[PDB]
């Protein structure tokens, strides 16, 4: 990953901290089945994707500019995103709901 050095300093050391969960398991299974190698890393600026002045805040921004193949994670299929990048078959059904109590 990338972490900024303190707050004022603009430097940073790319420390190593392994991460796990749901989608990482499917990534491992895909790597085993297709027999390739990966060097996955976390994002730096912003989170998810939101176009602003023809600029994307990472995630989508790091795949549109041919800087990182594939974007493995929690990405929702949308209308504008599918026009810039190319998606694949969904594996988990989801949408918009409410959480009143």
């Amino acid at each position: 990953k990338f972490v900024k050095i303190n707050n004022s300093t603009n430097e940073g050391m790319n420390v190593k901290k392994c991460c796990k969960g749901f989608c990482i398991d499917i990534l491992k299974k895909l790597s085993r089945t297709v027999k390739f190698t990966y060097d996955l890393y976390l994002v730096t600026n912003g989170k998810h994707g939101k176009k602003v002045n023809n600029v994307w805040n990472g995630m989508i921004g790091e795949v549109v500019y041919q800087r990182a193949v594939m974007a493995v994670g929690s990405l929702t299929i949308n209308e504008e995103r599918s026009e810039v990048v190319d998606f694949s078959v969904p594996f988990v059904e989801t949408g918009i709901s409410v959480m009143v109590s």
Partner: protein
């Protein structure tokens, strides 16, 4: 994989055995498969 063809608009479940020769679009209805069973009138009505 024939003549007239040219599209299919019907319930066509996505499966591995069918995705090689042809390809589908984004699904327009998510649906699994369940079990449908018969029903009978309960006999615990205290009729006797």
């Amino acid at each position: 994989l024939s003549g007239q063809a040219d599209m299919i608009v019907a319930p066509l479940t996505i499966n591995n055995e069918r995705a090689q020769y042809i390809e589908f679009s984004k699904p327009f209805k998510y649906q699994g498969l369940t079990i449908l069973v018969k029903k009978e009138i309960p006999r615990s009505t205290l009729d006797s």
